[PDB]
Subunit: 204 residues, 3 copies
């Protein structure tokens, strides 16, 4: 896509994120002053602030997906839709998005697809119990290159010791390349991505 | 602010600067040919060419403030207004704009403000004789972090020997960080900024 | 010359190039399936695919000229026009476009022009037999600095051995600087540019 245009879009998402942070800061400041007043109970404001922080999380995640992926794929909306659906169903998923660095020496290929990337196809691949669900999907731009791929697992001792093999594979690949690797937990439906050896929670 | 949009603005200011230089170049070429003619006296064109060069200086200064500061503050117009007012009154001023590098280990804090940045406040801080005028203001994006700050002074021998402590503090901080430091001289009202160990005259 | 705007234009040329490649890819897949049908003769599609490939070549060349030259000159359309005309007439040409690095220590000046760059002037310089045709033109932004210049010749043993002195001078200068050097062959009218020690065929 047009990198100049996409840069503008990234920048506007960043603006929106900062604006929700400012909204939350303002509401906390109001609460901090209101608690001193006998005719106020700041408990009535907690739902509002929780939602404000949920919005911060959503906007920031949208920002980083756009900033990190827009130069490398035109399919981020399709990927995000698939991820949301998989999360809701608690279907484990592991989606590698190739970036500037080539990955064929780091990934052991399961089944080659070279398919048009769509959300239904991503969701079908990760349906529990099916032949292609166990392992990683590789995405290059707007194609699903392959599925059921084997990735290197992090051996980092700075573990989150509760992390399963899906998460460790994302982290492990992200340590050896500039790939961004999305994970959906089969246990909780929590969605994450790994980039440069670090796992980040996202809410999409 | 939107970096893509701001880049376009920077680039247009650069275009305008180049255009003023071309205008000046053209007028000089006219003058150079006209002097040979006994029915011409090129002295009549000198005020025009002085003005053209004044415009070059103003456009270039606007260009560099925009290019160097726009990624790091949305308050450059407020800062510029304050500087213009301070210059006209010959009120000494020293304004640090934090850029990519953090400055807390390099600046000894005077008084913490954490204030909304406005021109009246900057101008009030630097009103001669007042408790906050002696030392530097620190700006981070759209906040005045602090005032009356102490900066490291350059010990360089290659700098103008007639430079006071305000100018040496600007140069000094600029040698240790990527901060841009604006100065208004209390002696002449001349406005400068230091960046990367070099002091540049500006006219706003 | 607004770099933000020019970046957008480069990016759109890239998009157009990718789209022509997709068109060619699609036609080939059609042909690959059609050959199995004995009521089809895929020879009728060869002209089409040849044209498609010619379009890929044209779009890609336009993209690279734009991406490599737009930050350094506003005269690329004039240069392209001159090159097209010289190519058609099979008039040898060698045009250095100065980029980020200065070239005065690497180029031995023939005749200094410091002229407004226009296509008629470039074409006049390289008219066969004339005083200025033998050697390189140097372009800095929108000026023809000089002509009949002498450039260093590549010593590279890994070159094409059928390359004449024009092509070797282009390659040679491109090894010592970031200049882009356009060549028109006097033998065939083939147009190339050298960049960083590599010669690329262009069609425009």
């Amino acid at each position: 896509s047009n990198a100049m245009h996409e840069w503008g879009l990234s920048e506007e998402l960043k603006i929106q994120t900062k604006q929700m942070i400012e909204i939350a800061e303002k509401e906390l400041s109001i609460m901090r002053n209101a608690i001193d007043k006998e005719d106020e109970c700041i408990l009535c404001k907690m739902e509002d602030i929780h939602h404000m922080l949920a919005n911060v999380q959503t906007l920031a995640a949208t920002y980083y997906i756009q900033a990190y992926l827009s130069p490398y794929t035109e399919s981020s909306s399709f990927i995000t839709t698939a991820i949301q659906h998989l999360s809701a169903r608690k279907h484990g998923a592991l989606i590698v998005v190739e970036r500037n660095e080539t990955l064929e020496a780091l990934i052991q290929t399961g089944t080659t697809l070279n398919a048009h990337l769509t959300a239904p196809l991503l969701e079908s691949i990760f349906y529990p119990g099916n032949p292609l669900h166990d392992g990683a999907v590789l995405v290059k731009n707007n194609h699903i290159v392959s599925a059921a791929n084997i990735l290197p697992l992090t051996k980092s001792t700075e573990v989150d010791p509760e992390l399963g093999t899906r998460h460790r594979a994302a982290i492990g690949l992200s340590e050896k390349s500039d790939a961004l690797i999305l994970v959906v937990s089969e246990e909780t439906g929590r969605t994450s991505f790994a980039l440069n050896g670090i796992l980040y929670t996202i809410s999409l």
